[PDB]
Amino acid sequence: PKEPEQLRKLFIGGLSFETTDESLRSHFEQWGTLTDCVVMRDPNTKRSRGFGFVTYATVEEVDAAMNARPHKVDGRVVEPKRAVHLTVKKIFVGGIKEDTEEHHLRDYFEQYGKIEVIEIMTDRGSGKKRGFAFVTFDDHDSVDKIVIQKYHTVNGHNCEVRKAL
Numbered sequence: 001p002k003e004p005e006q007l008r009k010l011f012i013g014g015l016s017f018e019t020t021d022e023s024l025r026s027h028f029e030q031w032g033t034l035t036d037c038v039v040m041r042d043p044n045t046k047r048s049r050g051f052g053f054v055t056y057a058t059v060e061e062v063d064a065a066m067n068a069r070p071h072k073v074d075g076r077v078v079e080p081k082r083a084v085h086l087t088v089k090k091i092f093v094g095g096i097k098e099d100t101e102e103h104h105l106r107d108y109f110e111q112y113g114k115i116e117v118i119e120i121m122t123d124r125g126s127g128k129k130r131g132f133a134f135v136t137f138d139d140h141d142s143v144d145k146i147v148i149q150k151y152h153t154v155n156g157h158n159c160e161v162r163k164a165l
């Protein structure tokens, strides 16, 4: 049972105009089997549009490629992103109620990426927990992995997680 193809793709921006299907493939095959690899070109001039995409056989291979950033492809640092692009480093986490603490959020979310800020929201008047939080990571891929999951279970609660700002 293969993961949906959409979840196995990486959109690569910032390509050198000299990158080809073949050179993009040779680079990204270092992190997995590529079932597809395309440089986007103008239909008349054939000149590169400066971006393309690759499709891996599995999501773990996407992860491996993302974990190997920064990628210098044909002499230029490129910008790979997965499909979810609203590129942000912060998430809203809702439904955590009053008993969820910082360490619950950190122990779970730290496995998606490096956390810089955890903000458990409290009432401006009473100080009581409001039941939601924001987590800021050092990089957008953490957020992208998070928001494509169907479910997040933290401190026994099924949470609603969305990109923030």
Ligand SMILES: CN1CC[C@H](Oc2cccc(F)c2)C1=O
Pocket: 011, 012, 038, 040, 051, 052, 053, 082, 083, 084, 085
């Ligand atoms: C999630 N996004 C935003 C841009 C990207 O657009 C494309 C579309 C086709 C080929 C390609 F190489 C890139 C995409 O599908």
